[PDB]
Design a protein around this nucleic acid. Sequence first.
RNA 1: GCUCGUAUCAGUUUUAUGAGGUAAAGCGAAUGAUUAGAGGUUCCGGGGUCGAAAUGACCUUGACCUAUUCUCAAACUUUAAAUAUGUAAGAAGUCCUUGUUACUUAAUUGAACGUGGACAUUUGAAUGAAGAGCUUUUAGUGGGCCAUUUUUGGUAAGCAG
RNA 2: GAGAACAGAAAUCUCCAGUAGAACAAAAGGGUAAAAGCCCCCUUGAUUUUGAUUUUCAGUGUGAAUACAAACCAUGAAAGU
RNA 3: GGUUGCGGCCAUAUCUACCAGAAAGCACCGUUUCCCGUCCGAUCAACUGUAGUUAAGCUGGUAAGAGCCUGACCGAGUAGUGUAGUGGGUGACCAUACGCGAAACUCAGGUGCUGCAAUCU
RNA 4: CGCGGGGUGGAGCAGCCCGGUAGCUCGUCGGGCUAGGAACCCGAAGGUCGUCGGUUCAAAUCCGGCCCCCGCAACCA
Lengths: 58, 169, 294, 159
Amino acid sequence: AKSKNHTAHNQTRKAHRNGIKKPKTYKYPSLKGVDPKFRRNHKHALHGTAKALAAAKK
Amino acid sequence: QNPMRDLKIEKLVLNISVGESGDRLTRASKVLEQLSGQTPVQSKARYTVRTFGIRRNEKIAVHVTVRGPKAEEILERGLKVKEYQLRDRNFSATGNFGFGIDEHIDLGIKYDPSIGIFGMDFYVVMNRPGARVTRRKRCKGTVGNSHKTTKEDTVSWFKQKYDADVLDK
Amino acid sequence: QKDAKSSAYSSRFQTPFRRRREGKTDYYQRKRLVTQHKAKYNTPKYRLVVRFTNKDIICQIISSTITGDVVLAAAYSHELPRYGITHGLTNWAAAYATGLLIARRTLQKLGLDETYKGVEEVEGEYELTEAVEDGPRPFKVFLDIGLQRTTTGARVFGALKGASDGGLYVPHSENRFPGWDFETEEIDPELLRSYIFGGHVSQYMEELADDDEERFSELFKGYLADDIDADSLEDIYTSAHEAIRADPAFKPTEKKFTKEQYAAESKKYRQTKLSKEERAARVAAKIAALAGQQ
Amino acid sequence: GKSHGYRSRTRYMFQRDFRKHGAVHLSTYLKVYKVGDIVDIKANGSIQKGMPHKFYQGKTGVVYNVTKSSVGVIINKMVGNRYLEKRLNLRVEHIKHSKCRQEFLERVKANAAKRAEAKAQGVAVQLKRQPAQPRESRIVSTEGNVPQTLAPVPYETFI
RNA sequence: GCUCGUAUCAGUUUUAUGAGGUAAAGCGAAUGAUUAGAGGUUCCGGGGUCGAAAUGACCUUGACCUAUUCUCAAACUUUAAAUAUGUAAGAAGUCCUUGUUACUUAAUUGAACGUGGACAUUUGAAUGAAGAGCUUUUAGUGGGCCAUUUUUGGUAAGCAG
RNA sequence: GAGAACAGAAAUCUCCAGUAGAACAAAAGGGUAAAAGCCCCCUUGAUUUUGAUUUUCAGUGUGAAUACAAACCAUGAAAGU
RNA sequence: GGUUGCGGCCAUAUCUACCAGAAAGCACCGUUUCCCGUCCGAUCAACUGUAGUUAAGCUGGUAAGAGCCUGACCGAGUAGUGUAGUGGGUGACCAUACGCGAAACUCAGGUGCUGCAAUCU
RNA sequence: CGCGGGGUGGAGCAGCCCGGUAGCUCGUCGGGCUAGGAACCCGAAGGUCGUCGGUUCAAAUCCGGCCCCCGCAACCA
């Protein structure tokens, strides 16, 4: 017995019930996937700023 | 006017298209190098045919390019064989001309028992100074229409030089 | 007449770039030399552009922008001749000197003159401009040879060697200079040194004077007419180049010529455009009598 | 059977252009992309490395990573009932700066400039954009413009 | 259920900016088809005034030539909609000789992230917002069918997709 | 398209013209002209390590692999690749 | 304004055929001792600033030029199409309402523009 | 209207351990034997391999179309 093969009928309606919300955005995205050379250097630069800031507001 | 645009042999090409390779080819190259004074190059066969007994890259022919005084001096020796007579249709539309002769000994070459008889074709390319623009890597130009070579111009330069004629054809 | 290509062939023809169809720039190599590493965002990749024409060796340090390439400094071989020394401007030794000229000029412009002096005592030995400690890294430029053929003992590498000893850090290998042997992967510093100071040109002078004085008079006539021998090398070695020829500002240009009268004399001899109304008049002249036949 | 390869149904999408084949003009390699830049994706069919998938043709994203020849682009892709964050490693030939983004930055500077001028005098500059408004009343003069009366034309064959 | 006293959002428009090869159109535009007539030319063969009569006072595939002309394409196309579609329209935004770095630069050059400074009734289109955002867990379902419009196979079907 | 002594419709040889009407292993479609095609030189980056990504997608696996990082290399004058 | 070198957009730049080009500038160019690959110093390499060559390259002008580009109440609000009716028509299809709106065609106009560094009576 | 093989001189077979630009037998023809036929002996000719289109390493054997010789399956309500 043959059945129905495929239809996207009702699929858009289902996807809109509690649906298509955009992904929540953040300040400070994850530094994964960015260049390690930039990541390694960024770690040193952020460290110095925290030390530099701490000295200023001692 | 015409200060420099007179015709002049760009190059002369000696061609021996032997049927096969081996002993006949090397001897054909030996006469070609003895007559030109410069080592020749050997043409590979482009493809196979049913009648000539030929196959790809079979080393079928041999040819050499000579320019300058040597090209003119072998043309005179070559034109000597043809009693300074060439066909009109023998000259190409773009301005070239060539003649084929058999039994290369008729040139005035001391025959050698090893080399034997070899029928070879002389071809001459004409131009005027300034053709480097169409053969140089930088700023490849196209020769102007007035500076181009025609069949009539290369015929007249052939008749003006050598007092050699052509027939009605 | 009838000898015209198809309107379809002309409609579908994609023209090459203007500089491609002028046989001027290898756009394939230009992309490599221009595209900067994207993480060095606006850092200009600098080119040591070397171009040879007859009578002229052109050496310019160039960077790239969208609106066009920008010249940082220039050095041409044609600086001397109009005062009476028109000799060897177009050889390996001059290509060296203008490579040395662009290096000293460029370094002095950005302030790296007193440092990175380069190879001060020239010996023909292959080496790179090496970075100083606790000081700035050397100016970096990349050889741009255009469509010129890269060969051992090429003139394009005279400017390369000259720019290197000038102080400009140019990556290069020694396997394209005169004197490099192909059998052994070794250079001959003497042969390279001789080429830098015209020893190959000087060698031709001696053997030609012995063998063919007729040719020795046809070419290198200027050297004979200027009474040039191997005793003027010392003067240009230390007295000229160091004392006064290293800073030759020392030249008359404070009455900068009037481009307007350059334009006026060129324009008056330039053929002018034929306007719309006269074009209709010219087509009217042909149709009326010449083509109308009354 | 069915066929769903990487570049299926890309015949005209990845076609180069009419009379625009061959080498790419170098200004595309002179453009600079920083993290946060809004870029469009138009795949160049001549350059086969760093190629976006056909789904990302015409998609506009934000740069998050800058490498030797490529930029990481964040693109929001609709998967089912929510958007998923996708990260594209695209070579520069397949991207270009968004023009609307650059236009809005000029408005940011123009808005700040207009605020500076108005703050000197307090004239209620009203930086906020407005929709096209209904037309105000106008008077149409008839001198030299007498109304020309029109009627429906009769039917005719024209064949 | 969990995290706030005005929710950073939206099956919508506007403005701006992209992407697309469908409809239509085109074929005296490429590819592929396709109807007719308009010059010459023995570069093998169909024929003769005259008999090879020499490129011979003729036409027939044109074996060498361009100007037209009728009609077309799901797997053709220069062009190219409508509808649909991506992004943006800011407080995580914008304007200083570095403040940091081991990255990068020829170089305090940049890159990224910062300290201090200047910006609530307009906080940088419209309309709305019914509270935002978030988590855990679990039921049923996983035979579908019918309008309009687009559309494939089929003569068609209350047919199949 | 333009010649030749047995050379011819197909062996060469030389000039022209030539937007690709060629070639690039294969099916088809894209792409490619100072190349991605053809010839020459040098090579093994068709290598190490383990992460991030794209496509099918549950955003699991598999297959392809896009961009990097840290090595070692090849090539090239070099940029680079 | 000419020219050279490096460019950007990449025909408003290409193509055909003629006409013109002063100074500046390729090279008419000339040569093969030297680095440099081959049959060929033709290309490529190197060496010179010569009789003085603008013949060609190149640039400009021309052409009811081909092509290309721009524009148009030119065709044409046409083709097409989003939405609507218990509109019409056996049907095929069509008309209408609220919107969007081509391409051919025709007619005009246009013969690259321009950045950086030099150089030029 | 599905699945398979095959097509080479007048006739029957050789290119099927991927290639001798086509060979071997009968038939036919010529000569010789014999007083002619036959049988026998000695020689010769005969098919660019069904047709068309694909790699261009002698490609058409091996690939894709149409025709022809055939063969098996054509059932269970």
